[PDB]
C-alpha cells in the first residue's frame, strides 16, 4: 500500500524535498507555541507504528524541548 512509500519517504531525510519540508515545518512549529494540540499527526505512518489509531479519545500534542 501507501504506507511503505510514506515510510521510506520519511526515511530519506537528506534529499531536497525532505530538507525543504523539515525546514518549513521547523519554522512553522517554532512560530507556534511551546505546547499545543496537533489534531492530526505530522507522521501518520510513524503514529500507526507507535500505536495511534483514528478514533475518539486519541489526542496528539506537539510540544517543543529546548535543545542542549
Amino acid at each position: 500500500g501507501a504506507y511503505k512509500y510514506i515510510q521510506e519517504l520519511w526515511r530519506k531525510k537528506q534529499s531536497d524535498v525532505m530538507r525543504f519540508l523539515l525546514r518549513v515545518r521547523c519554522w512553522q512549529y517554532r512560530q507556534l507555541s511551546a505546547l499545543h494540540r496537533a489534531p492530526r499527526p505530522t507522521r501518520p505512518d510513524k503514529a500507526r507504528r507507535l500505536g495511534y489509531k483514528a478514533k475518539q479519545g486519541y489526542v496528539i500534542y506537539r510540544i517543543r524541548v529546548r535543545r542542549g
Binding site: 501507501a2 512509500y5 510514506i6 524535498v17 525543504f20 512553522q28 507556534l32 505530522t42 501518520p44
Partner: protein, 233 residues
Amino acid sequence: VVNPLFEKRPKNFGIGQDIQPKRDLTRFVKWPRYIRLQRQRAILYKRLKVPPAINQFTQVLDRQTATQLLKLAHKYRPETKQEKKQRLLARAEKKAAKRPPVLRAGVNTVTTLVENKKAQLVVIAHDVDPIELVVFLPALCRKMGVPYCILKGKARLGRLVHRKTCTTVAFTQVNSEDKGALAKLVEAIRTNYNDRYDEIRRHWGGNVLGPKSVARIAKLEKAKAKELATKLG
C-alpha cells in the same frame, strides 16, 4: 425652489488641516498570531525554492475538464448509510421471498489497485496538509502508465463521497454508457500529465520575490537601461 440655507461644507483632509476619516485599514490590522502565521507561510511557499515533487501539485487541471470529471464522478458515487440499510432490507425481503462499480477512495486502496493495474483515472487533491502522503503517487502512476489528474480543493472531492475530505479517487470500472467520455477525459489528462512529466521534473519552484522588492529591482534596472540607452543614442 431649493432651500438657500443648505450650505456645502467640505472638509479639507490635508496634513494637519482636519481629522482623518475612518477609511479602509485592512492592511494595517495587528492580526492574531495564527492568521499572521498562515499568511506568511504561504508567502514562504511563494519565496523558497520549491522542489518539483511539491511543484507538481501547483499545476491544476482546468475548470472545463474538472466540471466534466465531476459530472462523470457523480454517476459512480458510493453508497449512503441509509442506502446500505435499504439494500440490506431488499436482500432480507429477497431471502424471505451483480454489484455495480463504485469509487475506490484512500491512498492505500488507490496505490494497491494501481500496482494491480486496475485504475484508468486517478484524481488527486492538491491541498493535503501533510504532503508526504501523495508525493510518490504521480510518479508511481507515471511508471505504471496510469492517467492522473490534480484538482483544487479536497472538500469538493470529499463531497463527491459521503465524507469530509478525500485525497485520492480511483476510477476502476465504468459501464458501457460512460466509456466514451471517460476515454476523452483520459486522453486529455494523459496528454496534460504523462506526456509531459519530464518537464514537470525539470520545472523548479519558487524564487519569486515580493512586489516591493521586485518593483525596486525593476526600477533600478529600467533606470540603468534608460542610462545605457541615452549614452549610445
